[PDB]
Amino acid sequence: IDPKDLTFLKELGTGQFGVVKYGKWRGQYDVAIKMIKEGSMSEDEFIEEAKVMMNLSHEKLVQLYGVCTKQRPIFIITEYMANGCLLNYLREMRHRFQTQQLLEMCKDVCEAMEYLESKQFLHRDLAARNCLVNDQGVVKVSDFGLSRYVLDDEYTSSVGSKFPVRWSPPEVLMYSKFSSKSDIWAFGVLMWEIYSLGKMPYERFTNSETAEHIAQGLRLYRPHLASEKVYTIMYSCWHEKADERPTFKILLSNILDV
Amino acid sequence: IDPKDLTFLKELGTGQFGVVKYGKWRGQYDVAIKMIKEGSMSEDEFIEEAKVMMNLSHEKLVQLYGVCTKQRPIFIITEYMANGCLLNYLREMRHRFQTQQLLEMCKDVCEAMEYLESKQFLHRDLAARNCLVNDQGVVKVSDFGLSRYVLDDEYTSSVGSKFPVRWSPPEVLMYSKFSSKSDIWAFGVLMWEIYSLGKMPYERFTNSETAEHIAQGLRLYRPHLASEKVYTIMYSCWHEKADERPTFKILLSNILDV
């Protein structure tokens, strides 16, 4: 797909596969190049997923411009985000953050998650680490792709694994019950990450300890920067009964009038 | 611990935790700084494994210098390797090798592996992608960070996410039974990678067909740049019956004999 030759300057780092560099595609589009390894991925494996992900377009989703559908480290080309990942942004030196802009971030993410919701597309791993910020301060969700879809009512996929845990519903922390409502739980933790200015969820807990506590009733406390209403919103995402959880559509409305 | 008395440069090697970056340490030690991430993994956790890794040392093992687990993002500095990973090395400008350079590389890796074996430390992910090459052309094995210094000879794990199936023996393919002989198998495949000049194992297969292929007792074909003798040593690594697969000391003695 992507004409393998384009401008290239430095690199960025890593997300879910390998090294992501930087360059200019079509002499007008700034891009980040996601590299794999010619010993795992292939032009025949992701062709399906590539087309499907390109079906995902929204100003709040980091866009996949194209992929080098050939063989060797797959040179996938995405939207260059000048300010890096949200996690590093929140902790930014000069913490000049007002609740006004803090909420805007939750809004940018919610809009993106809202359209993914509508499009019936699960993110699987929603967290501030998987969100990028561009030169304008706009937060857009990325690291989606191998992120699941849905079918009759659920699935299984890779049996046995290590999930992020903190951003996961008690359902998944035990028998990996991923659903439309799984991303909802993680979105609340993300909101928490936002109002926490980068604070890692469940700090002072281990993964095994965090897992046991969520089931018993343990939840995230209100961050000093969040208002009572903002805490209500993020907390609606954590009902152990997935059915009682709101949609990104509702989550979007409530956020718009806080 | 390590006070950040480093500078900054550019892109570098990767690992399942992430990529690394360039800098100089305590005068003139070229280092590649890897991130473990923010909060996710805590200072206390890595401390043990850090002590354990720094106790490892062989000129054919990429050395860990220190840990910068200073609350915020945990960093690790390993020795910088100018030519990058062996996989990239095998395909790039250096492509024009000779059997002499191919066997030398297998020896470098077998020297580092024999050493790990004597220290009961297993490398659960040996592949060409995990080896790095310095400016002298020396090949060193890396990314054995998460690897386990298993006290007991039989090893059990947690497992999930995905598996580098193309370098795994059937008992790892079936229930993650890693041991010394699991590395031997993976090393044997690495040899096939060296000799086929950086080609991916079973590229027309899928992770599932590869498992079926191995289940039939079939392995990786003799590459045109390997003698019947060189093929005999790598082929031994894939015996199926774990106890019929040679030790790294024997493999190294085989390699030397020529």
Assign residue A172 the CATH number of its domain: 1.10.510.10
User: Do both A161 and A251 map to the same domain?
Assistant: yes
Q: What region, left, alpha or beta, does residue B255 occupy, with left being phi > 0 and alpha being psi -120 to 50 degrees? A: alpha
Contacts 24+ apart (CB under 8 A), A40-43: A40/B129, A40/B164, A40/B166, A40/B200, A41/A17, A41/A73, A41/A74, A42/A71, A42/A74, A42/B203, A43/A68, A43/A69, A43/A70, A43/A71, A43/A74
Q: Where are the alpha helices (DSSP H) in chain B?
A: 43-54, 86-91, 99-118, 170-175, 180-195, 207-215, 228-236, 248-256
Cα separation, A71 vs B203, whole angstroms: 10
User: Do both A164 and A103 map to the same domain?
Assistant: yes
Taking the CA of residue B159 and the nearest CA in chain A, the distance in Å comes to 6
User: Do both B42 and B158 map to the same domain?
Assistant: no
- Lookup: tokens for A69: 């559908």
Question: Rounded to 5 degrees, what angle do the CA atoms A18, A21, A26 make?
Answer: 125
Q: State how many domains chain A has.
A: 2
Q: Which phi and psi angles does A90 have, rounded to 5°?
A: -55, -35
The interface residues of chain B toward chain A in range 113-142, judged by CB-CB distance below 8 A, are 127-129
Task: Decide if A129 and B21 are in contact by the 8 Å CB cutoff.
Answer: no
User: Do both B22 and B104 map to the same domain?
Assistant: no
- The strand ranges marked E within A92-247 are 131-133, 139-141
User: Do both A243 and A185 map to the same domain?
Assistant: yes
Contact B122, B183 (CB under 8 A): yes
- The three-class DSSP label of residue B133 is strand
- The domain boundary, picked from B41, B56, B80, lies at B80
- What's the CATH code of the domain at B66? 3.30.200.20
Contacts 24+ apart (CB under 8 A), B6-12: B6/B31, B6/B33, B6/B77, B10/A10, B10/A11, B11/A10, B11/A11, B11/A19, B11/A21, B12/B80, B12/B84
- Lookup: tokens for B156: 């059990």
Query: Annotated active-site positions of A, please?
Result: 125
C-alpha B86: how far from chain center: 10
Count of beta carbons in the 10 Å neighbourhood of residue A216: 7
Q: Which residue has the tokens 């690199």?
A: A11
B197 CB contacts (<8 Å, ≥6 apart)?
B90, B91, B95, B97, B223, B225
Contact A54, A103 (CB under 8 A): no
- Lookup: tokens for B64: 């860990």
Cα separation, B121 vs B111, whole angstroms: 14
Which chain A residue's Cα is nearest to B189? Answer: A39
The continuous run of DSSP H or E covering B32 comes out as strand B29-37
- Lookup: tokens for B98: 């000779």
Q: Which technique was the structure solved with, according to the deposited record?
A: X-ray
User: Do both A136 and A235 map to the same domain?
Assistant: yes
- The domain boundary, picked from B54, B80, B106, lies at B80
Amino acid letter, A235: Y
Dihedral of CA B88/B94/B97/B103: which sign?
Answer: negative
- Lookup: tokens for A53: 């992900």
- The three-class DSSP label of residue A156 is coil
Taking the CA of residue A56 and the nearest CA in chain B, the distance in Å comes to 24
Count of beta carbons in the 10 Å neighbourhood of residue B183: 28
Contact B56, B116 (CB under 8 A): yes
Cα separation, A231 vs A215, whole angstroms: 20
User: Do both A30 and A129 map to the same domain?
Assistant: no
Dihedral of CA B1/B3/B7/B11: which sign?
Answer: positive
User: Do both B123 and B134 map to the same domain?
Assistant: yes
Contact residues, chain B, for A38 at CB < 8 Å: 87, 91, 198, 200
- The domain boundary, picked from B80, B96, B120, lies at B80
Task: Decide if B10 and A13 are in contact by the 8 Å CB cutoff.
Answer: no
Picking from B253, B244, B199, the residue whose alpha carbon sits closest to that of residue B221 is B199
Picking from B179, B159, B165, B177, the residue whose alpha carbon sits closest to that of residue B214 is B165
SS3 content of chain B, % helix, strand, coil (to 5): 40, 15, 45
Q: How far apart are the first and last CA of chain A?
A: 44
State the Cα torsion B158-B162-B167-B173 to the nearest 10°: 60
Full domain range(s) for residue A130: 81-258
- The three-class DSSP label of residue B42 is coil
| From B38, B129, B162, residue closest to A39, measured CB to CB | B129
Interface check A47 vs B, CB under 8 A: no
User: Do both A6 and A96 map to the same domain?
Assistant: no
User: Do both B49 and B87 map to the same domain?
Assistant: no
User: Do both B76 and B4 map to the same domain?
Assistant: yes
| From A13, A161, A200, residue closest to B160, measured CB to CB | A161
- The three-class DSSP label of residue A175 is helix
B26 CB contacts (<8 Å, ≥6 apart)?
B5
Task: Decide if A160 and B164 are in contact by the 8 Å CB cutoff.
Answer: no
- Lookup: tokens for B103: 């066997």
Taking the CA of residue A76 and the nearest CA in chain B, the distance in Å comes to 17
B181 CB contacts (<8 Å, ≥6 apart)?
B169, B242, B243, B245
User: Do both B243 and B119 map to the same domain?
Assistant: yes
Instruction: Exactly one of B108, B125, B143, B183 is catalytic; name it.
Output: B125
